[PDB]
């Protein structure tokens, strides 16, 4: 069938490629502008294939849909919109335009974790199960009826990147293809999302990913891994903002106290720079180990080398 892809990133690129190779006519690709030496991966791939590529900075202005962008969208005549990681607000005029409406990939077990940082909050809350949902867009925020869903186990030391790469990305592409297949054969369902279990969490930016040290080590570990790599959990250390990556909870080594004491403002207790990384303490006195640190200038550095 005729499909418009509205999204961005590698995931968008992969969904576009698999849908095209399934035999679907991609009539248009709607993604983000270059910024600015960098073209979005979905834009690159579609352009290679001679598919119309649109780079709208925005779809609406002062709450109202922008007519130019809506008409340009409608010109390609999609019978279905597919939205893999759309970071822009898409007007319901576009959403409802095609024959089959629009479907959206969302990396949580809806109705849990509605909102654009679902993966982060899956880990921040320490969920044991995670996964993705493909759902039909309605006017709400990730509230639309479910087409399909897929589950995976969350690992104790999963960060955003690892759960994404192990399951959410590759199984997500497969799930998007299967969903379009179900729509094409005419048997895709619409399961109204249940009320119970529904949550929303805020979008994770640098501005709101600052570490609260007054928590158990397990909560701090979850916060750090739940923002690793993006946007990066951070705290102040000796004057400057430092991001923490590659966390794991520890057991019983004592501690080995062979490490070098590192004062961290607000921390329950001074940290330890050890040969294996930065040992941090929660308010329960329990430890986590951070592998890497990054400073204001994106300079990444192993935790073990803070002083060295």
Short mmCIF file of N, CA and C in Angstrom, two decimals, residues 110-111 114 146 191-198:
data_model
loop_
_atom_site.label_atom_id
_atom_site.label_comp_id
_atom_site.label_asym_id
_atom_site.label_seq_id
_atom_site.Cartn_x
_atom_site.Cartn_y
_atom_site.Cartn_z
N UNK A 110 2.48 0.20 26.77
CA UNK A 110 1.31 1.04 26.98
C UNK A 110 0.21 0.19 27.62
N UNK A 111 -0.56 0.78 28.55
CA UNK A 111 -0.64 2.21 28.88
C UNK A 111 0.45 2.74 29.81
N UNK A 114 3.43 6.47 29.09
CA UNK A 114 3.16 7.36 27.96
C UNK A 114 4.15 8.52 28.04
N UNK A 146 -4.39 -0.09 20.85
CA UNK A 146 -3.23 -0.94 20.56
C UNK A 146 -3.45 -1.84 19.35
N UNK A 191 -7.20 -2.46 20.01
CA UNK A 191 -7.49 -2.77 21.40
C UNK A 191 -7.47 -1.48 22.22
N UNK A 192 -8.64 -1.03 22.69
CA UNK A 192 -8.67 0.18 23.49
C UNK A 192 -7.78 -0.01 24.72
N UNK A 193 -6.86 0.93 24.95
CA UNK A 193 -5.95 0.83 26.09
C UNK A 193 -6.71 0.82 27.41
N UNK A 194 -6.29 -0.03 28.36
CA UNK A 194 -6.99 -0.05 29.66
C UNK A 194 -6.63 1.18 30.48
N UNK A 195 -7.53 1.62 31.34
CA UNK A 195 -7.29 2.75 32.21
C UNK A 195 -6.23 2.42 33.25
N UNK A 196 -6.39 1.26 33.89
CA UNK A 196 -5.48 0.85 34.95
C UNK A 196 -4.07 0.60 34.42
N UNK A 197 -3.08 1.08 35.16
CA UNK A 197 -1.70 0.92 34.76
C UNK A 197 -1.16 2.10 33.98
N UNK A 198 -2.05 2.97 33.51
CA UNK A 198 -1.61 4.09 32.68
C UNK A 198 -0.74 5.06 33.47
#
